Design a protein around this ligand. Structure first.
Ligand SMILES: Nc1nc2c(ncn2[C@@H]2O[C@H](COP(=O)(O)OP(=O)(O)OP(=O)(O)O)[C@@H](O)[C@H]2O)c(=O)[nH]1
Ligand SMILES: [Mg+2]
Lengths: 206, 488, 349, 230
RNA sequence: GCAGUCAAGCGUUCAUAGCGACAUUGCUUUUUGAUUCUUCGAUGUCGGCUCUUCCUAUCAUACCGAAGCAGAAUUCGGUAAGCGUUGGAUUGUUCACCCACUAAUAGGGAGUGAGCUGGGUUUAGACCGUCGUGAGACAGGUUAGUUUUACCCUACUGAU
RNA sequence: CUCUUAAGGUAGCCAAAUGGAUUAACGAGAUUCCCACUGUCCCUAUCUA
RNA sequence: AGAACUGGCGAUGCGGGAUGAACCGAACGUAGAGUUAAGGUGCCGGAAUACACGCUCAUCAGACACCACAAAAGGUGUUAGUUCAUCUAGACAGCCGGACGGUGGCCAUGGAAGUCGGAAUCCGCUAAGGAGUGUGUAACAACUCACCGGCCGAAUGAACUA
């Protein structure tokens, strides 16, 4: 590697105006589904992002009290933080938290069977291996091939029940990893439903 | 250099058309106007034709019967000040200026060399913008003549670093906190050791705050207050050179101390606790404020800019006697103090729980509001001089503007790349300077909520800044050794 | 699961936990390969060690995460009590660290195994293997402070008494040094210490007894001081949350005597400060240590301060001792019979 | 059960009559049982034991040292203390890689009898924008498990690493082929996105393109490390 | 692994010419057990019935040691290979998984390519895809397809 | 140079009875399942030339 | 790894290294006698169960590829050295006695009196005695060591090298 004044030097760089230009355009843009992205422009994104949350992360307790002092033989922790204000407010702060518990048992009764089968002393059956298919590494490998190979993925949908037959997951992957791949639905089996229903679904998916 | 990308073939033909003009059509529609103060009072209905915002002063000034000019706003959705009426009745929101203009600080004067170490602190004199002291990691402090850009008495005494410094509000005495155990009082003019050094604290000194003038008797010097890493606070008398009462409520180190309006010390400390401390009880606690999940860094007051300067307003034209200095110190205080005709000093804190609580300690030991926003720790907090906006510096490279009265979020300043260490205001309450872990300092237009001007200069980290009270001059100091002064 | 958590595996410190799981791979998996085997055989060998060492950890942590009682969504009494012993934030963090460290080991396993299928010699494969197991060892070495914490909470939380909130109980409360352990000693079978100084009991003890062919449960509970009441100790707070959360009766215990270094006005000031705990409850007061000193003997202005305690809507003020044990047997009968009326009046709704 | 039962039991009933005599002797024998374990314990149990005993010495040096040290007797601001943390490239002349290693041959056909496809076994930065090409037209296969996006860059100043995204591969030693496929190797010089560090040129512009040299062989462990050329 | 930090020592003699053990800090993505549905190109053959033996790097049974080991159950470790280690479902593939019994369903070696087979060697037939002007070949994919010993010496098992 | 999202309630208008290759029948063609039945198997035993 | 030179083998038997392309010895006609090389001398096996001074015990020593690898270290295994210390003003090992006063030092707290903790770690009387090495009490108590001292009487300790 031949020594050079190139390297050590700064290659790319950005204007302090141009940051102020690009930070605004996150606010403006606006996507349009009939439009589609070919190239992205190389941009220092970590500078342009961080938008305003209104909440903050939680405080770091480990710094103030370790663990050995929080509980043990070593244990320097006589009184609780933050602790309650007053014994009216404590007894107020119990009685709702009782009834909130007493709710969840009456709820998770009606959600249910699962315990009563264990009390009766029997288990539910084995799930059949065919209901997996598929799933399987051999075919999902075959999937991530053709996404990587293709320049427009298209995604065919059963025009009886397209919401059930969509899948999320891949579309969430595609936007994160590979935005240059274009993506487009095809409702088909448009015979097997009535004519208004197909016309509706293309409206609700367009 | 990555660019702002070019205008398209259509966007040229947009520009090539003649368009617009400012015009003002005539303009005379009779639209009704209400007048409202931001303090409290509503004052009831006029209905004129449309006019320039210079004239709506002259409509008000005869009605109230003053000659006080006034700043205007409208639509509070929106919040934004014919110039309104183009955006489409108007509730007009009037508010006093304190009439001024401090300029945007643009150019450097060339870099003043001196002591061969990092610069740890840097305080202007109150009364004039020529005089400015710096404390370095070299054991010398140094006072700079800032008009001539050159050293006025290179100053020696200590045998460790000098961490904080402060100029007394009357402007007789400088005080210098140290990494050893000591404080040394100095005269600016002579630059000589006023007796033996003040020794009392066992570990290093964290901050130094002066007793402000309007409390102190006319013809007595102001007492110092000094917080230290052992966690005590002592109150130093300058003449006798001896502490009256040690105060030892806090268990951990005290991060900063401030002397308040009404005889009341405040001490922000590493035991997650803010101790309101009455002077008249002769070293005694009155109220103990607990919110924070981490330790407390820094503690800003609403009055702190007025208490720091103490009588010397922007001209720097001196008090003829102490009895005058009493009244001048009281009048600059009572510009900001009587907001609704009542002395409601606001206190605010920063801490590593990523949060600032807002306090009014005389009225209630509860907090008012929880300013929550930042990702990493807030470090410096500052009220604006007029007690109207708060702003706080943080380690997530961004400075957040909060309304002072109700602790309500306003906006965020974005621009800084690396972590922001401290900030300071222009006296007119418009411009706002900030300093970073990177080279650059930046100055922030508070009215439009925007970057006014970036200024690069230094070779390394920049720890300290301060704005001069007149608002010609801004100092800076950091790791590259060189003091840079900045001006218009 | 409900009511006491004895069965949680046990959980080594990171030095030893690493020493287990690494050495189990050396033992259980085959340890010989030779370089002039076929590359498929060399790749299989090393793949299997990274996998097996992965699932060594992802076993060991999963038993911790499954074992430990899941502090919110237990029951608000227990949810509290484990805060007041173990600290609820440190508790929840320490487990959540182990939950994160579970995921990184899986990630490291799955990423390296996918590299290790392209390994073109023994050396490359061998280095990729050591590179995987070093990363796992580094993740687990970063777990030294939580595992030491959890190991000690496991030991303690096994040793708690099971109390049902839902059963008929009775709390037994007051100042230190009053008597209220030696009541619990003599009413039921239990080993609780009876020693003349303040905080002898430091946690909630339990004992059961049958009256009217029905299991009750007494709870002896360490003792309360009056205080400014924002700050009381983790020892004292147990009792306050016991009186707050649990249903049941409660016996207040006064010592009317010169004994206890504790003034008898301050016992009443305790009662009136604690009063808003009792609103749901049903209460009795018990004057322990009669035999020396008596309630009848007392000064009049002093004896007014019992009649102040009478004014609270639903109480009674029993004499008792532990020298004659017919009298202590009457106290439980009144205590139970006041309870069962409230349970039946609750049931018949 | 309930609370500190064994402790209460020891406090009342009391230990075991020859407990003291047992425990005292075990500590006497422990001297002998260390020296037996050292001269038995074959084969790994022997290695571990010695590795441990070295540490249990090296600690006891440092305790006795620190006692002898304690027997005798940069500068930052307030808000930063009470805290903690030629034009030679640093690797000139790296080992040369043959073209026959790196490029594994892939044969195609029912009779596996056509060769011609080549697989890059070394690690690769590929692009932002990639897509594979048709299987008939392809040849120089860079497989997806060996496609690094982010490197692990470190600074000679400061003493902090950051996990930074790769922007390009500019100079690759051992031929201009492997630059153009984007093969990371040891020695290779790569464009790094630097924005988490927060470097600013004098001029006031702020920087997000630094060249960095890779310090390790990321074949032999999956991580691509690198040092900034500052 | 890379980049450092401390320093018991080497470096002919040697503190501060360069090396340097044991410790130790940096991230490889959120500190509140949330999910984290990430399955991302093994270009090379193994897999299973029958049956034997060996190793121990011990899953179970035997005897010990240490743990907040009260019991009960369990974890970790020592000697230990005497003796065991199963039944099924799944090829839109199984370099694996699940559920069921069980004291327990440990890991390996020599395997059982002439004892018998299923995929793959693997040729002639045929179709679909990709490539080729074409003959044809292959990024593929699918279907049909004869190797049949012992009677010799030895070993082994029984027999004079 | 300018420019593309309308169809609405369990089966619709429509076109020379149907809206079709989701094609009947046939097959030593390839493959999955169910009943019946069984020494395929648990687990082998016996008999004839 | 590629260059340069000189040996050895290929065309070459024979003695030794248990066996062997390259290792140690060695000028091949056929015989006899003598003396040796390298290697050997318990028995197999020709030749000392020779002589002399030391070292080593391995619950599967070693008899060696050596001027390497697993290697750098772990051991209350043995012997010989080197450099500092301590000692009839009594060492080392044992028992016996002392180990105290300001004081229960300050904050901390339900309770912490040298010994759950955090900051200091000082003065006095001393032959000597830490604002305490550990066991131990809810806290104190009692015991212990580190340091003095009496009894006993002459060598002993520590760290390295081989
Ligand atoms: N004279 C007398 N003394 C009693 C009686 N009951 C208890 N005591 C005394 O109470 C002292 C011990 O108190 P505990 O019974 O432990 O009551 P407690 O300390 O409040 O209870 P815990 O804190 O839970 O142990 C003993 O010294 C007893 O002598 C009594 O009937 N008569
Ligand atoms: Mg008691």
């Amino acid at each position: 590697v031949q020594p050079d004044r190139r390297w050590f030097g700064n290659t790319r760089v950005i204007s302090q105006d141009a940051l102020q230009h690009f930070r605004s355009a996150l606010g403006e843009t606006q996507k349009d589904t009939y439009q589609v992205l070919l190239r992205r422009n190389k941009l220092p994104m970590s500078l342009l992002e961080e938008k305003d949350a209104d909440e903050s992360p939680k405080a770091r307790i480990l710094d103030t009290e370790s663990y050995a002092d929080a509980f043990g033989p070593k244990a320097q922790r006589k009184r609780p933080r933050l602790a309650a204000s007053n014994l009216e407010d404590l007894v107020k702060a119990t009685n709702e938290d009782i009834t909130k518990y007493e709710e969840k048992q009456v709820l998770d009764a009606t959600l249910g069977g699962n315990q009563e089968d264990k009390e009766n002393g029997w288990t539910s059956a084995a799930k059949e291996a065919i209901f997996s298919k598929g799933q399987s590494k051999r075919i999902w490998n075959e999937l991530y091939k053709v996404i990587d190979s293709s320049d427009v993925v298209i995604h065919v949908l059963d025009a009886r029940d397209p919401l059930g037959t969509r899948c999320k997951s891949v579309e969430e992957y595609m936007k994160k990893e590979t935005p240059h791949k274009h993506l487009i639905y095809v409702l088909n089996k448009c015979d097997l439903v009535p004519t208004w229903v197909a016309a509706a679904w293309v409206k609700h998916l367009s | 250099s990555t660019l702002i990308p070019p205008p398209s073939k259509k966007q040229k033909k947009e520009a090539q058309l003649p368009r617009e003009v400012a015009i003002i059509p005539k303009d005379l529609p009779n639209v009704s106007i209400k007048f409202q103060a931001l303090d409290t009072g509503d004052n009831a209905l006029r209905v004129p034709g449309a006019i320039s915002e210079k004239q709506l002063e002259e409509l008000l000034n005869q009605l109230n019967g003053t000659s006080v000019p006034y700043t205007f706003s409208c639509t509070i959705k929106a919040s934004d000040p014919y110039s309104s009426l183009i955006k489409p009745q108007i509730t007009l929101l009037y508010t006093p200026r304190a009439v001024f203009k401090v300029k945007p600080v643009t150019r450097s004067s060339s870099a003043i060399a001196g002591h061969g170490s990092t610069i740890l602190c840097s305080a202007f004199a109150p009364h004039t913008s020529s005089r400015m002291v710096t404390g370095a990691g070299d054991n010398t402090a140094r006072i700079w003549d800032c008009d001539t850009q050159t050293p006025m008495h290179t100053l020696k005494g200590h045998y460790n670093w000098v961490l904080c410094v402060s100029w007394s509000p009357d402007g007789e005495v400088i005080a210098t906190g140290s990494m050893d155990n000591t404080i040394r009082l100095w005269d600016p003019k002579s630059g000589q050791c006023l007796g033996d050094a003040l020794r009392g604290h066992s570990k290093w000194i964290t901050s130094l705050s002066w007793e402000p003038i309007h409390l102190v008797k006319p013809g007595s010097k102001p007492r110092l207050a000094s917080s230290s890493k052992d966690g005590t606070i002592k109150i130093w008398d300058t003449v006798s050179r001896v502490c009256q009462y040690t105060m030892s409520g806090h268990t951990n180190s005290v991060s900063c101390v401030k002397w308040g309006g009404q005889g009341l010390l405040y001490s922000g400390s590493h035991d997650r606790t803010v101790r309101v401390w009455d002077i008249n009880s002769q070293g005694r606690c009155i109220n103990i404020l607990k919110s924070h999940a981490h330790w407390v860094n820094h503690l800003s007051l609403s009055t702190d800019y007025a208490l720091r300067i103490g009588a010397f307003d922007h001209t720097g034209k001196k008090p003829s006697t102490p009895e005058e200095a009493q009244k001048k110190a009281l009048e600059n205080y009572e510009k900001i103090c009587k907001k609704n005709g009542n002395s409601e000093e606001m206190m605010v804190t920063a801490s590593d729980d990523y949060t600032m609580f807002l306090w009014n300690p005389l009225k209630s030991t509860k907090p008012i509001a929880r300013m929550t926003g930042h990702q990493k720790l807030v470090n410096h907090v500052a009220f604006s001089p007029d007690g109207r906006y708060i702003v706080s510096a943080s380690f997530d490279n961004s400075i957040k503007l909060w309304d002072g009265r109700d602790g309500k979020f306003i906006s965020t300043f974005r621009g800084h790349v690396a972590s922001v260490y401290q900030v300071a205001w222009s006296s007119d309450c418009r411009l706002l300077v900030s300093c970073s872990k990177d080279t650059t300092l930046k100055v922030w237009d508070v009215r439009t909520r925007k970057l006014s001007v970036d200024l690069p200069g230094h070779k390394d980290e920049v720890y300290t800044v301060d704005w001069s009270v007149d608002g010609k001059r801004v100092c800076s100091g950091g790791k590259d050794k060189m003091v840079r002064l900045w001006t218009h | 699961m409900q009511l006491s958590w004895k069965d949680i595996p046990t959980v080594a410190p990171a030095n030893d936990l690493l020493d287990i799981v690494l050495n189990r791979t050396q033992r259980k998996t085959p340890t010989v390969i030779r370089p002039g085997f076929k590359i498929t055989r060399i790749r299989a060998f090393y793949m299997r060690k990274v996998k097996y060492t992965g699932e060594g950890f992802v076993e060991k942590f999963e038993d911790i995460l499954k074992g430990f009682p899941n502090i919110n969504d237990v029951h608000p009494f227990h949810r509290d009590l484990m805060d007041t012993l173990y600290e609820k934030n440190h508790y929840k963090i320490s487990l959540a660290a182990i939950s994160r460290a579970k995921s990184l080991v899986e990630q490291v396993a799955r990423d390296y195994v996918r590299l290790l299928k392209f390994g073109q010699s023994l050396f490359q494969c061998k280095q990729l293997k050591r590179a995987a197991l070093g990363r796992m060892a580094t993740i687990v070495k970063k777990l030294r402070d939580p595992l030491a914490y959890l190991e000690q909470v496991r030991q303690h939380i096994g040793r708690l008494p099971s109390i049902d909130p839902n059963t008929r109980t009775l709390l037994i409360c007051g100042y230190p040094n009053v008597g209220k352990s030696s009541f619990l000693r003599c009413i039921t079978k239990s080993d609780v210490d009876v020693q003349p100084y303040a905080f002898t009991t430091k946690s909630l003890y339990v004992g059961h007894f049958d009256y009217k062919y029905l299991r009750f449960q007494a709870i002896d509970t360490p003792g309360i001081l009056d205080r400014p009441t924002e700050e009381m100790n983790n020892i004292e707070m147990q009792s306050i949350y016991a009186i707050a959360h649990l249903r049941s009766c409660v016996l207040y215990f006064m010592d009317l005597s010169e004994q206890c270094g504790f003034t008898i006005e301050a016992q009443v000031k305790l009662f009136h400060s604690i009063k808003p705990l009792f609103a749901n409850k049903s209460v009795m007061v018990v004057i322990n240590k009669t035999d020396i000193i008596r309630p009848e003997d007392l000064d009049e202005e002093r004896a007014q301060l019992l009649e102040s305690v009478k004014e609270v809507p639903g109480v009674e003020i029993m004499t008792s001792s532990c020298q004659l044990e017919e009298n202590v047997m009457e106290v439980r009968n009144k205590a139970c019979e006041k309870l069962l009326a409230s349970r039946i009046e609750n049931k018949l709704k | 059960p309930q609370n500190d039962y064994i402790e209460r039991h020891i406090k009342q009933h009391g230990k075991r009559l020859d407990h003291e005599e047992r425990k005292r002797k075990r500590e006497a024998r422990e001297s002998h049982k260390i020296s037996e374990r050292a001269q038995k314990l074959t084969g790994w149990k022997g290695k571990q034991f010695a590795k441990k005993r070295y540490a249990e010495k090296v600690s006891m040096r440092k305790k006795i040292k620190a006692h002898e040290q304690s027997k005798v007797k940069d500068a930052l601001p307030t808000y930063l203390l009470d805290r903690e943390q030629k034009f030679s490239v640093p690797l000139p002349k790296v080992r040369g890689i043959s073209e026959e290693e790196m490029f594994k041959v892939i044969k195609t056909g029912k009779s596996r009898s056509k060769s011609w496809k080549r697989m890059i076994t070394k690690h690769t930065f590929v692009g932002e924008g990639f897509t594979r090409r048709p299987v008939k037209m392809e040849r120089i296969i860079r497989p997806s498990a060996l496609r690094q996006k982010k490197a692990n860059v470190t600074h000679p100043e400061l003493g902090v690493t950051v996990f930074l995204p790769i922007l390009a591969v500019k100079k690759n030693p051992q031929s201009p082929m492997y630059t153009q496929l984007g093969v990371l190797t040891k020695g290779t010089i790569i464009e790094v996105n630097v924005s988490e560090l927060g470097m600013v040129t004098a001029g006031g512009k702020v920087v997000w393109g630094k060249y960095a040299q890779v310090t390790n062989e990321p074949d032999r462990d999956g991580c691509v490390n690198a040092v900034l050329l500052v």
